[PDB]
Amino acid sequence: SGAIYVGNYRVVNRHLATHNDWANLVWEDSSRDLLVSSTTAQGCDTIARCDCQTGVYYCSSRRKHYPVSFSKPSLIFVEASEYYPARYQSHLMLAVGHSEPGDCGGILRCQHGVVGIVSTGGNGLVGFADVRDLLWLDEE
Ligand SMILES: Cc1nc2c(CN3C[C@@H](C(N)=O)CCC3=O)c(F)ccc2[nH]1
Ligand SMILES: [Zn+2]
């Protein structure tokens, strides 16, 4: 589990969104595994607006933050899980690192801010849904 809290937005994995998220929906995209809902309180996270391909992510199944090198956002084939059939997920970045299904939502960040959240995994790989192209998170 986990979310990004930027401005009056809450960014979560679409497959983990709650009824309150769906009832206060701003934007969702199944192909990216992302959903954004509105919040009453202002959040403290800042979104990275950069080209970094190194950063650090939080792994709840180890209670640890790990440094990683990750690929550029791309269209990657992801195996079937409890939440999606086997399909192509867009704007996904891969790294070598530990992840279990409940690790989804952990933040990946660089010196510029939040880069994305854990969305996929297995066999010593971890995949992150990028948010750096969602410029509208910084306003309105
Ligand atoms: C064996 C294994 N499968 C893992 C998944 C699979 N997965 C893919 C998600 C997606 N975005 O398609 C939907 C939810 C989900 O559980 C992880 F996300 C993380 C670690 C994993 N280890
Ligand atoms: Zn950066």
Swiss-Prot record:
Reactions it catalyzes: Selective cleavage of Tyr-|-Gly bond in the picornavirus polyprotein
Top-level taxon in the UniProt lineage: Viruses
Record-annotated active site: 15 (for protease 2a activity), 33 (for protease 2a activity), 104 (for protease 2a activity)
Annotated positions binding Zn(2+) 1: 50, 52, 110, 112
Chain's role: Cysteine protease that cleaves viral polyprotein and specific host proteins. It is responsible for the autocatalytic cleavage between the P1 and P2 regions, which is the first cleavage occurring in the polyprotein. Also cleaves the host translation initiation factor EIF4G1, in order to shut down the capped cellular mRNA translation. Inhibits the host nucleus-cytoplasm protein and RNA trafficking by cleaving host members of the nuclear pores. Counteracts stress granule formation probably by antagonizing its assembly or promoting its dissassembly.
Quaternary structure and interacting proteins, as annotated: Homodimer.
Annotated protein name in UniProt: Protease 2A
Organism of this sequence: Coxsackievirus A16 (strain G-10)
Residues of the whole record sequence present: 869 to 1008 of 2193
